[PDB]
Design a protein around this nucleic acid. Structure first.
Ligand SMILES: [Mg+2]
Ligand SMILES: [Mg+2]
Ligand SMILES: [Mg+2]
Ligand SMILES: [Mg+2]
Ligand SMILES: [Mg+2]
Ligand SMILES: [Mg+2]
Ligand SMILES: [Mg+2]
Ligand SMILES: [Mg+2]
Ligand SMILES: [Mg+2]
Ligand SMILES: [Mg+2]
Ligand SMILES: [Mg+2]
Ligand SMILES: [Mg+2]
Ligand SMILES: [Mg+2]
Ligand SMILES: [Mg+2]
Ligand SMILES: [Mg+2]
Ligand SMILES: [Mg+2]
Ligand SMILES: [Mg+2]
Ligand SMILES: [Mg+2]
Ligand SMILES: [Mg+2]
Ligand SMILES: [Mg+2]
Ligand SMILES: [Mg+2]
Ligand SMILES: [Mg+2]
Ligand SMILES: [Mg+2]
Ligand SMILES: [Mg+2]
Ligand SMILES: [Mg+2]
Ligand SMILES: [Mg+2]
Ligand SMILES: [Mg+2]
Ligand SMILES: [Mg+2]
Ligand SMILES: [Mg+2]
Ligand SMILES: [Mg+2]
Ligand SMILES: [Mg+2]
Ligand SMILES: [Mg+2]
Ligand SMILES: [Mg+2]
Ligand SMILES: [Mg+2]
Ligand SMILES: [Mg+2]
Ligand SMILES: [Mg+2]
Ligand SMILES: [Mg+2]
Ligand SMILES: [Mg+2]
Ligand SMILES: [Mg+2]
Ligand SMILES: [Mg+2]
Ligand SMILES: [Mg+2]
Ligand SMILES: [Mg+2]
Ligand SMILES: [Mg+2]
Ligand SMILES: [Mg+2]
Ligand SMILES: [Mg+2]
Lengths: 145, 262, 206
RNA sequence: GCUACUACCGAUUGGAUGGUUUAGUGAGGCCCUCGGAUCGGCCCCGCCGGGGUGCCCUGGCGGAGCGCUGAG
RNA sequence: CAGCCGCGGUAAUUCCAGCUCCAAUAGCGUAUAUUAAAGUUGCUGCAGUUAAAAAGCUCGUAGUUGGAUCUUGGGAGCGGCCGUCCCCUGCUCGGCGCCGGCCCGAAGCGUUUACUUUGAAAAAAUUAGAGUGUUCAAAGCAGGCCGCCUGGAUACCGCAGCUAGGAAUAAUGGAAUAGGACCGCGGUUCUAUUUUGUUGGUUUU
RNA sequence: UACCUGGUUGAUCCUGCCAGUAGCAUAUGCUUGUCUCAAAGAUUAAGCCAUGCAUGUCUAAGUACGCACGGCCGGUACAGUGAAACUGCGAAUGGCUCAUUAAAUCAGUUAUGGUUCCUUUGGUCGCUCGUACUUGGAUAACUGUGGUAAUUCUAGAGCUAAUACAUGCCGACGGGCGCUGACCCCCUUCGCGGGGGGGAUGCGUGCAUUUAUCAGUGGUGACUCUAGAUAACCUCGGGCCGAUCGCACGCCCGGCGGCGACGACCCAUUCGAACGUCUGCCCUAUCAACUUUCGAUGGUAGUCGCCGUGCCUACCAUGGUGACCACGGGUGACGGGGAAUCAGGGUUCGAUUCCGGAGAGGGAGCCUGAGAAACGGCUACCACAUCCAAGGAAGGCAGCAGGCGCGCAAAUUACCCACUCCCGACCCGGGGAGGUAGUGACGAAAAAUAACAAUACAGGA
RNA sequence: UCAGUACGAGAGGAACCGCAGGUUCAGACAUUUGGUGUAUGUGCUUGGCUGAGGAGCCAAUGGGGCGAAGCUACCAUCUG
RNA sequence: ACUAUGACUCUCUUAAGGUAGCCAAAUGCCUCGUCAUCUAAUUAGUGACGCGCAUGAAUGGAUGAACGAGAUUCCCACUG
RNA sequence: CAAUGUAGGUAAGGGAAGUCGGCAAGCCGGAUCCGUAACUUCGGGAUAAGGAUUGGCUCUAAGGGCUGGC
């Protein structure tokens, strides 16, 4: 869709400027510097969590994770954690063993199947050659008759 | 048209399903599958219109979602899956395997069999393709690709498969004398011995047949289905034997049946 | 777009066709690639069915083949010499199919030298000071001398090809459609066909 | 001779509607070659940890060539 | 008023009323397109001396139509002189097998159309149409016995295309400066290939 | 039931026409009590539309650090719900209409040995010889400042995922198979030779891809088919060889493991689609010759395109159709399946509920997608329309109702997913498709508005 | 603007001071735009002539582009 | 047999009494005749009408392609 | 090197409104290749109308003579 906007070039022909304070100067502004707000979130996917805190491949994350509280009247105080993503867990290790035993199975199928076909086919040629030897005995009879 | 049609009108459905004139506007469109749109029978139809257990789709959905039924030895939950000819619809709770075979009229018949004989099925092969590493592959009428078969399995043959494994046990060759179901056209659901084969380059070859009662009839290969050695079958056949008796013989038998009922 | 269709033109008899629909997306043609000589630049193309097509625009090398010895090799594309379609594919250096390019003899001279232990090219006068090629041609064992002397029986080559080798440049014909595959592969011209194209060039010169 | 009606010719290079097209101009997409706002990445040195054996690898604080180099 | 003929100028069977009487009956009237009636567009099926009608005469390519002439009969058995069933191609591999030969089966080849008969093939819906107590019917394809029993058929479906039978009627070729058939004889040139115990090559037969 | 009658005359017989007669639609008039079916703004204006709705969707199984709800046993993540948002899939079907369009569409008939295919189904899915006990970095939803007269318009600051996007190995894999081959051995010979073997080191070493040469497992009526041998080739705008997910939890002095979900390249498959063959269409001569360098008919080589072809480009050749009606003009012509009428022959109609085509103001152009030259997706110009603070904003009922206008001429802004089927990630959602009622003398079927007895009378066996 | 007011049933509908501009006329000027342009200023160019190149000339202002200064226009501007 | 007109008839005057054709023209006073077109607007111009003060038949009438240093009217492009 | 003249030139915007009247000046102009109506004594009308091209430099090809298919 085609829409009209205004050019980037600044002049008095403007109504606002959104400004971001980079460096904190001499004076102490009461509205801004006093009230501290934290950053809402930290890495969600475990692999970026692993890069974040330099944890090893083997060890557990559950132990180090921070969990922020939940508390209000009626309900009890609680703490809500994140879904550990990328966890090398016994289940997943089972999935890992699983695909390799299945790969065992497809390799077993291809090999047994090729050997079975080779036996059936080589046997077929053996009987066909014996019948040809039969055709040749009939061939000498037919030429002599 | 910018593409394929997703709906089906009630009248355009083929009449050999015997769908009625006045209940509703639509018919259930088969999903693609191993069987063509026009030769097949939806499961909902075999169930409600044919078998009459369920009235509506909510009851079919719950029975279908119980997952008892197992089509071609594999579980299928798509209600418009086309189960076709020789196709064994097995139910476990009842302990009842049915095989979809044709009546004397083009329609199918309710021909029950035991689970023992019902335990396997037959498949006509269509083409022998040679595979990626000198590996022969087969292609049947119902799209099963079996690899490493015998080179002796050929063009118009059949095979006696096993539903559990999906592997060719035996096969029956196209030769003189073999029985033959006619699987399309005017003689659809006929049975008769292969008396003669007439070749035609370009236009496809005709097969002359002789009925049990000497009534000859020809048919084209597309509508042919080999079924046994000689004139002696290895399978269960419908009552009637695909004979298609005449209007006079039906007047006598039907009328006499009315007389017998009283 | 550039439609491909019969309807836009007359019938056999001469009568004019009235058009029954507007243009369709299957009645489609596309702009020609016209891939030129230069450092690699291949743009990819989506087509019907989500398929790919690697349309070449600039192309420096190609997997050119010597058919007789059956020794194809990847080589830099040095120049377009002649084009049968339109002399403008000669005039403007543009790569297409059936383009008669030139290529550096050295790899062919090098392979034959390894195989037969004979010289390829080497204008009458120059001799190797390093002596590596002669060391390679000599110092054969007894067992391997039977093999290489027997090879000398079929180690003969044509004068017409050898004269170009002495010069250094082989005539090559492109076969692969670069606008299709993104490569400018082809095969070297040989023998009688080659005498023909030199006769045609002699004629074009006049 | 009288009353009524009907088509016809009829100055106006007549007017009004569509329809093929010849010729000028011709927005705007699509394609191509450049382009490179802007945003990276690598390397380069100075101030410091952690590991190694004066040398090899890493993270921060400054500068700047932007030495090279990327999407665009 | 009256589609039309006609009615009405002082006893109006034709107008306006009343009195009656007719047709059809929950239906009838009026208008327009259109169809049979139309042997008034005619192939089946019209006219053409005088009712409307034949070029003033002859020539003339396409178009349309065209004489006669070539296979008639034969063998065995059959039914009440008569009719009908049985039969009217020819030219590498095995058994009705029998004592190399004979026949059959199979493969390939057949001077050619129109014409006629078969089958397949034909989208359904529709039409005709079998069945079926919607209380009858119009409809529908359902239903019926007191667990069981059944139906949910069938026909027509131009024209062209294909498939195998028939060969009277209408074409169409063929031997006439015989460069004519069969079956044979010998050259010139080219080779399918078998060959001489084993390594290699050629011509022969 | 294969039917005629009045009428020119002073009267007769003819050719001959006019009027009568019976069906089938459209309208209107008058009348009208019951029950079962039932068409319904095509005919003029492909003229114009206010309003509302007509396509969305989540599993135990792609993503939860909002208590927004929820077990209490925590500090060794997550019981379980979950607005929202990302992700994925669909929205090319259905519906409405018939203006254009005359061998075109359509019908039948065949062909793709000249092709593509999201999905469905079935085959393959540790075949490569050279961190994997699992890697990298954003981004939304959230919080907090706002802007406009005005759009389901949106900006800046904090943040963050994946079956999104990127990078990439050990493994099985332990070796084989071609070639290279220092050198080594045996045999024979006076020895060179001649014969037989080996051999360090190096090169190659999956499927899929591309080109060239050599030979002929399974097919075919016939393949340049299928498959084989060798040389090598392969875009970083990188092709595959699983950096996912849920249910149970076992068995072996942490090691082997189940059943699925989802996602994968290629091959077959299905729905089908798309080019071609054969034959067939109404009026017109007050339309008799037509075509061409702007391709007409052939040829050669290419381009594009998934292939065949003037599809397009270049160079040559000069062809092709025509009284067997071409060519041109008309058509109140979308086609067919069918309907009405009938003795037999025929005649006219067929927008219309099934199939095929085309189209959404006029024309054109395009992104996105397996699939669109899409119109309930965008960009222009033209036609027409709506608001403004003057800078700007937004538009398309030949969807349903309803309305304007044209007319002789045509319905209620109703109820429901309960039936039929369809979509979606789906055991849960949605559906003006559809169905159901209201109006409705286009029409079809059956059927009341009195029957009986006794008394008189008139008549009759 | 005064004023949608006085007046008049209504229909209709003014005037005085101030403010902004215009027509016609007269008198100057030329910053800017335009015109002119043989400063024969500067490229290009047709035909011929100086052996060729270079540099130039003749064709009654050879032709065509752009153009300084200066004159100059309700065709620019100012004041009454 | 509407008025008008007068097909038709007679008469006076002369030897008959303008037939075919044509126009407000280079021929028409009253006259810028009337109507239509051409213009925003037209005493001009073009096409019909005819009572023609005073049209008219080798004192030749009507037409008519080509040609004109002939007379008028309009339109395009173009211009001090 | 002033006005008045005589003979030469050029002008934005407008385009005969000036004027008895397009008087005068100005536009058009040669060639090739297309295309060319009304009417007609069928010879004409006709360069009708109406469009496009045009330079320099560097190449190819086709057309001829003479002596012993060259
Ligand atoms: Mg009366
Ligand atoms: Mg009749
Ligand atoms: Mg009739
Ligand atoms: Mg007469
Ligand atoms: Mg007569
Ligand atoms: Mg005559
Ligand atoms: Mg006559
Ligand atoms: Mg005859
Ligand atoms: Mg009469
Ligand atoms: Mg008479
Ligand atoms: Mg008659
Ligand atoms: Mg009548
Ligand atoms: Mg009506
Ligand atoms: Mg009543
Ligand atoms: Mg209508
Ligand atoms: Mg209509
Ligand atoms: Mg639709
Ligand atoms: Mg139409
Ligand atoms: Mg039909
Ligand atoms: Mg349809
Ligand atoms: Mg169709
Ligand atoms: Mg459309
Ligand atoms: Mg559109
Ligand atoms: Mg809407
Ligand atoms: Mg739509
Ligand atoms: Mg509309
Ligand atoms: Mg429903
Ligand atoms: Mg609806
Ligand atoms: Mg007032
Ligand atoms: Mg100035
Ligand atoms: Mg000036
Ligand atoms: Mg010079
Ligand atoms: Mg100037
Ligand atoms: Mg006049
Ligand atoms: Mg006169
Ligand atoms: Mg005179
Ligand atoms: Mg006179
Ligand atoms: Mg005179
Ligand atoms: Mg004249
Ligand atoms: Mg001027
Ligand atoms: Mg000017
Ligand atoms: Mg004046
Ligand atoms: Mg003047
Ligand atoms: Mg003059
Ligand atoms: Mg003229």
């Amino acid at each position: 869709k085609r829409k009209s906007v205004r050019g980037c070039i600044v002049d008095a022909n403007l109504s606002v400027l959104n400004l971001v304070i980079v460096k904190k100067g001499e004076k102490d502004i009461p509205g801004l510097t006093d009230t501290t707000v934290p950053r809402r979130l930290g890495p969600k996917r475990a692999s970026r969590i692993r890069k974040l805190f330099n944890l090893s491949k083997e060890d557990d994350v559950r132990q180090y994770v921070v969990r922020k509280p939940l508390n209000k009247e009626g309900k009890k105080p609680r703490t809500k954690a994140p879904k550990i993503q990328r966890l090398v867990t016994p289940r997943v290790l089972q999935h890992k063993r699983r695909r390799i035993a299945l790969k065992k199975q497809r390799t077993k199928k291809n090999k047994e199947e090729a050997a079975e076909y080779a036996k059936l086919l080589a046997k077929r040629m053996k009987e066909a050659k014996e019948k040809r030897q039969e055709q040749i005995a009939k061939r000498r009879r037919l030429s002599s008759l | 048209a910018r593409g394929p049609k997703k709906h089906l009108k009630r009248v355009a459905a083929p009449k050999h399903w015997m769908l009625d004139k006045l209940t509703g506007v639509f018919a259930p469109r088969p999903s693609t599958g191993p069987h063509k749109l026009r030769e097949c029978l939806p499961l909902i139809i075999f169930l409600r219109n044919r078998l009459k257990y369920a009235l509506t789709g909510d009851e079919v959905k719950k029975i279908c979602m119980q997952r008892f039924i197992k089509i071609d030895g594999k579980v299928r939950t798509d209600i418009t899956y086309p189960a076709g000819f020789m196709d064994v619809i097995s139910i476990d709770k009842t302990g009842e395997n049915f095989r979809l075979i044709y009546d004397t009229k083009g329609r199918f018949a309710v021909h029950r069999i035991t689970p023992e004989e019902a335990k396997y099925k037959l498949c006509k092969v269509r083409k022998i393709f040679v595979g990626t590493k000198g590996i022969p592959h087969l292609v049947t009428h119902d799209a099963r690709t079996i690899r490493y078969p015998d080179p002796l399995i050929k063009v118009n043959d059949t095979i006696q498969i096993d539903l559990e494994t999906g592997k060719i046990t035996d096969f029956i060759k196209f030769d003189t004398g073999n029985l033959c179901m006619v699987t399309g056209g005017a003689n659809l659901g006929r049975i008769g011995v292969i008396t003669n084969r007439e070749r035609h380059p370009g236009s496809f070859d005709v097969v002359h047949v002789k009925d049990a009662n000497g009534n000859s009839f020809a048919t084209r290969l597309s509508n042919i289905f080999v079924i046994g050695k000689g004139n002696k079958p290895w399978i269960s056949l419908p009552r009637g034997k695909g004979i298609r008796l005449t209007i006079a013989e039906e007047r006598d038998k039907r009328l006499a049946a009315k007389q017998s009922s009283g | 777009g550039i439609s491909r269709d019969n309807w836009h033109k007359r019938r056999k008899t001469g009568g004019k066709r009235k058009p029954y629909h507007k243009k369709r997306k299957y009645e489609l043609g596309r702009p020609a690639a016209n891939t030129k000589i230069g450092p690699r630049r291949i743009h990819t193309v989506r087509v019907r069915g989500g398929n790919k097509k690697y349309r070449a625009l600039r192309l420096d090398v190609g997997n050119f083949s010597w058919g007789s010895e059956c020794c194809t090799r990847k080589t830099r594309i040095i120049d377009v010499v002649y084009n049968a379609s339109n002399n403008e594919l000669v005039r403007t250096k543009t790569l297409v199919k059936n383009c008669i390019v030139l290529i550096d003899s050295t790899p062919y001279r090098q392979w034959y030298e390894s195989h037969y232990a004979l010289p390829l090219g080497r204008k009458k006068g120059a001799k190797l000071t390093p002596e590596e090629e002669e060391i390679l041609n000599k110092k054969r064992s007894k067992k391997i001398q039977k093999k290489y002397d027997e090879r000398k029986k079929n180690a003969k080559i044509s004068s017409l090809l050898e004269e170009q080798f002495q010069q250094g440049k082989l005539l090559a014909c492109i076969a692969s459609r670069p606008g299709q595959c993104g490569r400018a592969d082809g095969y070297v011209l040989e023998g009688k066909e080659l005498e023909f194209y030199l006769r045609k060039i002699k004629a074009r010169k006049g």
